[PDB]
Design a protein around this ligand. Structure first.
Ligand code: C2E
Ligand code: C2E
Ligand code: CL
Ligand code: MG
Ligand code: MG
Ligand code: MG
Ligand code: MG
Lengths: 261, 260
């Protein structure tokens, strides 16, 4: 009942272009350089103010609205990176990643939507990177397998988001074309004081090395977490310590100050 | 007018027609037999030695698996106790028993282990339980309670068929599984097949990262044994070393190694 209207309103937000993207710097931990940014959607509701994804993403995942919204995110994100490139603000090494739902494999619609967004923005494919939950391994059909290959063949990097909090098939993990793992922030938050979460993080790092995958740690909140991750060979990180998610202009501000150095 | 497999299986229990074979588990570094996996068979008067694949799946559909696993637990524990008592089992010998996920309904597993240890007098320490990897997809309070209970007793637990199912990293770090068993389907293909080899390499790295022991199942060749030994895989099981053996033939294996 109250859920149906949550969906309806979200649909109207797509209708009226009331979504906005913020971007969180992804950082090379050794050098401090911003080398990437995660696109994160927000809903500027003219009634409720800025509404956060955890309030609407999971419901949209259920009703199938996640697809239309994710088409919008893909387009806006590609356009924005291309705009920054054309304006001389993004260095050549900068990418942006977008969160994808498993609902997007249905009828191979993912491939088509990535292609439309790249074609319309004129963004280079390897500038875009996609992030999906581990749980995609639970729904591994020929259909899903086909999209993974399509994206590899385009150079669009795929990463596993929230790694450690889902279910992985160890055989699939070893076979499929994922290029990166993101250590979930719930483990990062607890290092180095908690053994269980600490050894989870070091195992992930060891898995990634053997699998030829890059690792991004999410949710770095302290100097201590930063130093441990770096000292142990975690390449990249994302967290409020360095920068919260930023509006476009403020993200691009960080780009500008980095170029000056 | 043949009897249903179900009737004939009830009758096998009633007439003591089931039997256990034991496959040695070997410490790769030294080649010493340090355990053995109990594997059930049906010595069926109409057919001879019938493998678990021809009745265990049927018993799982009907709930007769419960009664049947109770038999197995008890026979397995009884047997290790006999060998200990005859002086033939070393202090370090354990035996493992495959447990179906079905045995968790109503916390039956806890009771069935208590009863089998109480009947045989076997120290809980000497018994290991193997549960298929996919127990992690049905991980309820109920299941988490049997496992914590069993670990507290001192019963070792291992994840069987590993790599053919699904795992949560956070569970593996939190659940009381001391070890995992790399599935036979991956091992018999290494290193010739690069895909199954990568799967084994990944699994080894997973286990090492989490401080879990590894049994490689299905070692068929010397090259496979050296591949695993060199990569720190601690334990192995497979036809290269020894096929499943009847109790007496197993007992002779222990006698031979004891005579060093
Ligand atoms: N406490 C703390 N949090 C930090 C820190 N650093 C980053 N985060 C937060 O972690 C979330 C980013 O990771 P996510 O796993 O993709 O998690 C995302 C993602 O699963 C989903 N989501 C967001 N945008 C999209 C989207 O455009 N499409 C889809 N399908 N899902 C999205 O919503 C989730 C939550 O998004 P946000 O609320 O923006 O929350 C963001 C971000 O603000 C830190 O140091 N401390
Ligand atoms: N190709 C190959 N195979 C090898 C090798 N070494 C051992 N094996 C086989 O692998 C099976 C034992 O591993 P499992 O994954 O527990 O697989 C078991 C287990 O899941 C189930 N099972 C066996 N005994 C019991 C039992 O007492 N209770 C329950 N619930 N299930 C059982 O039936 C499955 C099949 O058992 P078995 O037919 O005895 O088949 C045995 C054994 O004969 C090798 O070098 N190469
Ligand atoms: Cl004793
Ligand atoms: Mg993400
Ligand atoms: Mg995440
Ligand atoms: Mg087994
Ligand atoms: Mg197995």
């Amino acid at each position: 009942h109250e859920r149906l209207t949550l969906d309806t309103r979200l649909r109207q937000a797509l209708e009226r272009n009331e979504l906005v993207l913020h971007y969180q710097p992804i950082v090379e931990l050794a050098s401090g350089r911003i080398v990437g940014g995660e696109a994160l959607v927000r809903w500027e509701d003219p009634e409720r103010g800025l509404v956060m994804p955890s309030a609407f993403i999971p419901a949209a995942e259920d009703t199938g609205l996640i697809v239309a919204l994710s088409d919008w995110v893909l387009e806006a994100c590609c356009t924005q990176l291309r705009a920054w490139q054309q304006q001389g603000r993004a260095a050549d090494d900068l990418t942006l990643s977008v969160n994808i739902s498993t609902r997007q494999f249905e009828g191979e619609h993912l491939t088509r939507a990535v292609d439309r967004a790249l074609a319309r923005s004129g963004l280079r494919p390897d500038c875009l990177e996609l992030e999906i939950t581990e749980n995609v391994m639970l729904v591994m059909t020929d259909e899903v397998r086909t999209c993974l290959d399509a994206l590899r063949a385009r150079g669009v990097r795929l990463a596993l988001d929230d790694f450690g909090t889902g279910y992985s098939s160890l055989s699939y993990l070893s076979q499929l074309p994922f290029h990166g793992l993101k250590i979930d922030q719930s483990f990062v938050r607890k290092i180095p004081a908690h053994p269980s979460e600490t050894q989870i993080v070091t195992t992930i790092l060891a898995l990634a090395r053997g699998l030829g995958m890059e690792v991004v740690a999410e949710g770095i909140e302290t100097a201590q977490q930063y130093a441990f991750l770096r000292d142990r060979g975690c390449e990249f990180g994302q967290g409020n310590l360095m920068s919260t998610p930023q509006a476009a202009d403020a993200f691009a501000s960080l780009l500008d100050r980095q170029k000056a150095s």
